Write an enzyme that holds these catalytic residues in place. Structure first.
Site, PDB file in Angstrom:
ATOM      1  N   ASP A 164       0.667  -1.250   0.117  1.00 15.88           N
ATOM      2  CA  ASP A 164      -0.044   0.191  -0.013  1.00 15.88           C
ATOM      3  C   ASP A 164       0.950   1.408   0.100  1.00 15.88           C
ATOM      4  O   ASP A 164       0.393   2.379  -0.263  1.00 15.88           O
ATOM      5  CB  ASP A 164      -0.737   0.249   1.108  1.00 15.88           C
ATOM      6  CG  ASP A 164      -0.414  -0.404   2.531  1.00 15.88           C
ATOM      7  OD1 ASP A 164      -0.904  -0.086   3.455  1.00 15.88           O
ATOM      8  OD2 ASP A 164       1.024  -0.489   2.364  1.00 15.88           O
TER       9      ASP A 164
ATOM     10  N   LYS B   5       2.676   1.107  18.014  1.00 23.30           N
ATOM     11  CA  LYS B   5       1.825   1.998  18.321  1.00 23.30           C
ATOM     12  C   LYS B   5       2.251   3.231  19.424  1.00 23.30           C
ATOM     13  O   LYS B   5       3.170   2.708  19.944  1.00 23.30           O
ATOM     14  CB  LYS B   5       0.492   1.675  18.851  1.00 23.30           C
ATOM     15  CG  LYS B   5      -0.663   1.709  17.619  1.00 23.30           C
ATOM     16  CD  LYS B   5      -0.117   0.626  16.522  1.00 23.30           C
ATOM     17  CE  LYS B   5      -1.472   0.845  15.438  1.00 23.30           C
ATOM     18  NZ  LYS B   5      -1.135   0.173  14.101  1.00 23.30           N
TER      19      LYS B   5
ATOM     20  N   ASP C 186       0.165   6.543   2.729  1.00 23.90           N
ATOM     21  CA  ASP C 186      -0.339   5.372   2.577  1.00 23.90           C
ATOM     22  C   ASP C 186      -1.792   5.600   1.548  1.00 23.90           C
ATOM     23  O   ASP C 186      -2.549   6.226   1.680  1.00 23.90           O
ATOM     24  CB  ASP C 186      -1.102   5.035   3.828  1.00 23.90           C
ATOM     25  CG  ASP C 186      -1.517   3.594   3.870  1.00 23.90           C
ATOM     26  OD1 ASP C 186      -1.732   2.744   4.905  1.00 23.90           O
ATOM     27  OD2 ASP C 186      -1.792   2.690   2.897  1.00 23.90           O
TER      28      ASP C 186
END
Ligand SMILES: Nc1nc2c(ncn2[C@@H]2O[C@H](COP(=O)(O)OP(=O)(O)O[C@H]3O[C@H](CO)[C@@H](O)[C@H](O)[C@@H]3O)[C@@H](O)[C@H]2O)c(=O)[nH]1
Ligand SMILES: Nc1nc2c(ncn2[C@@H]2O[C@H](COP(=O)(O)OP(=O)(O)O[C@H]3O[C@H](CO)[C@@H](O)[C@H](O)[C@@H]3O)[C@@H](O)[C@H]2O)c(=O)[nH]1
Ligand SMILES: [Mg+2]
Ligand SMILES: [Mg+2]
EC number: 2.7.7.13
Lengths: 360, 360
Positions: free
Chosen positions: B110, B162, B218
């Site tokens: 992607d 994250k 992205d």
């Protein structure tokens, strides 16, 4: 033979167009609605039409001056320094109604319908009493006052001017014939005829009920303007197919003024009335809308069930739908989506409105 | 030199498009997403590419061997039975990367950016550790894995998958070079690479970082797909201004395939890429949209921040906005309004969508 029209008043329901011009003077299928009612009264044959002007009273009086010479029928105004309601103009014009012992017509200026006038005075001569009403069945009662109607005589047992949810289906069509004997009952102070004198007159049983053939509609609300225009266009195609424009890009029942210009490669939907002096550019689709005078609508735009005010400019790729009313001299920018917006006069819209709201 | 591209993910985020055609095959500025990456890998001078996709799709199996002789480089694929995360593709294909003692490229499907593959590979040769990542600074680090960079030693102190504590501003950009040695850390058992093997590598100090230069984005999400398209168009204007289409009816950075046909009297807005074989009629305004191949857009319609799927027929006077996506073989009736509507393939629409919702 004299007829009375309750012209003027505030006209608070038709507001974004009545801020600029008075409510009888707004154009309903290329003509004012007061003009339609006085064409009907002139076609029936009436020497004197009394007309009350509680609103602006310049630009309502000068048009009556101009229209007297085209009709050839003598017209009078009465006006008042204060609003006498809708009853009080009878008491103001009591003398000029009283010098002749003739029954007189009473009309509401917002009502458009087929006009049964001299069948109605024949009905009044048959039953012989003082007051006759017009009655039309309408699905929703709560809009307009309702009468109780019996079979042959049509004497109203009971009157109520503001209906309940299910009291009756027959609605007052707002068109009456009153004798000279009723103004002796009315007083000089500001009252309202639809509630005061009709209840007490319904106590005596002097009221009788005349039906209507077709397409009774008020134009007082801006939605009701659109549906009444659609009904009038249908009945005009019934009576005068000549008058409606036929074209390859035209579908349905369309009424275009001669001075209006239609650009090619465009579709005009059903039930559309174009005013005098408009210009519709190439590739515009407009359905169920009423465009008033001198309004320019640019190319590649889609308008459906809308009212366009006087001297309005619609940009390119503008989508207007769901009773979006534009006031006088409103400029709409390009690529905008208006849904349900009533726009006050002399305003410009920078950005789209997704929901129905009033733009000041 | 070898290169592993992770495809997987039939239903990750590009959903109405991926219902018809796999994710690397959809067109991004008139080229497939995989084809941008393998063209940049040919410019890298890689010797063999291998894509690990967990589903065997027959059309892409035709496509890769059709592509590889224009590319000049053999293409292989590797299929896992149940999805082993994003590390299991590297563990299953361990033998092809371990047979030669050279660093191998790892890519996500992607990610699209300017690929600095020679500068990247040298950087890896200069620093000489077991793994080199490419990072970039983004405004919102929450969606991405965020690394802490030492000053001038590009060594990574900490790698968190994250954030939720704002460790740093720079994020992992989906571009790995890995040594042969770190092949023996991974296991054939299912695991995830950026969740597991990068943290314990960064604790030692074998992870190194290099910052990209421009326009990382992205295109996994459709909303992210549109802004990635609009960003790639500007950087491609800087690189190849003569490739971008220029004309009087054309505004801003527009990429038109030579087979595409644009009608008269219409304005193509900024950041619009047209597919091969599309037909644009008269008066169509298209801004910030992407039109995939063989999709016909009829006249007088307005589209803005939209994706149009393959073989789509859009009606006249239609207004589409707020990132709406059409699937393949979708026919939209005329005079409709689509706002936020994600549409499944082979579906015809005869109602306007007022609010964002999915239509099946
Ligand atoms: N001169 C003057 N005229 C007035 C005044 N108020 C109203 N009028 C005139 O009276 C007529 C009716 O006024 P509305 O206020 O619009 O009536 P409504 O709420 O719509 O209800 C009435 O009309 C319906 C039919 O249109 C009826 O069905 C209903 O029963 C009622 O009579 C309008 O043409 C208006 O010009 C006033 O204060 N002064
Ligand atoms: N074979 C296989 N491939 C997979 C699988 N899951 C994902 N992939 C591929 O691995 C890549 C990452 O998958 P995502 O799940 O979409 O990751 P992300 O939310 O975008 O975050 C990752 O990529 C970001 C940059 O795009 C990074 O910033 C972030 O650190 C993280 O590595 C994509 O190319 C996807 O096709 C799988 O289960 N099996
Ligand atoms: Mg009214
Ligand atoms: Mg994504």
């Amino acid at each position: 033979m004299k007829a009375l029209i309750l012209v003027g008043g505030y006209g608070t329901r038709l507001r974004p167009l009545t801020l600029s011009t008075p409510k009888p003077l707004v154009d309903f299928c290329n003509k004012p609605i007061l003009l339609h009612q006085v064409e009907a009264l002139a076609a029936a044959g009436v020497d004197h039409v009394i007309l009350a002007v509680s609103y602006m009273s310049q630009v309502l009086e000068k048009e009556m001056k101009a229209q007297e010479q085209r009709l050839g029928i003598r017209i009078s105004m009465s006006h008042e320094e204060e609003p006498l309601g809708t009853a009080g103009p009878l008491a103001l014009a009591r003398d000029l109604l009283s010098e002749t012992a003739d029954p007189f017509f009473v009309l509401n200026s917002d009502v458009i319908c087929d006009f049964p006038f001299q069948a109605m005075v024949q009905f009044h001569r048959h039953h012989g009493q003082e007051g006759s009403i017009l009655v039309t069945k309408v699905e929703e009662p709560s809009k307009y006052g309702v009468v109780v109607c019996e079979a042959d005589t049509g004497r109203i047992h009971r009157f109520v001017e503001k209906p309940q949810v299910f009291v009756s289906n027959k609605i007052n069509a707002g068109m009456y014939i009153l004798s000279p004997a009723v103004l002796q009952r009315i007083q000089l102070q500001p009252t309202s005829i639809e509630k005061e004198v009709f209840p007490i007159m319904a106590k005596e049983g002097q009221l009788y009920a005349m039906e209507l053939q077709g397409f009774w509609m008020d134009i007082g609300q801006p939605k009701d303007f659109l549906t009444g225009m659609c009904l009038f266009l249908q009945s005009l195609r019934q009576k005068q197919p000549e008058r409606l424009c036929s074209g390859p890009g035209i579908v349905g029942n369309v009424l275009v003024d001669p001075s209006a210009r239609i650009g090619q490669n465009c579709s005009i939907g059903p039930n559309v009335s174009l005013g005098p002096g408009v210009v519709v550019e190439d590739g515009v689709c407009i359905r169920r809308c009423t465009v008033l005078r001198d309004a320019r609508i640019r190319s590649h735009s889609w308008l459906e069930s809308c009212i366009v005010g006087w001297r309005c400019r619609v940009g390119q790729w503008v989508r207007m739908e769901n009773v979006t009313v534009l006031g006088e001299d409103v400029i709409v920018n390009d690529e905008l989506y208006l849904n349900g917006a009533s726009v006050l006069p002399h305003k410009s819209i920078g950005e789209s409105v997704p929901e129905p709201r009033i733009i000041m």
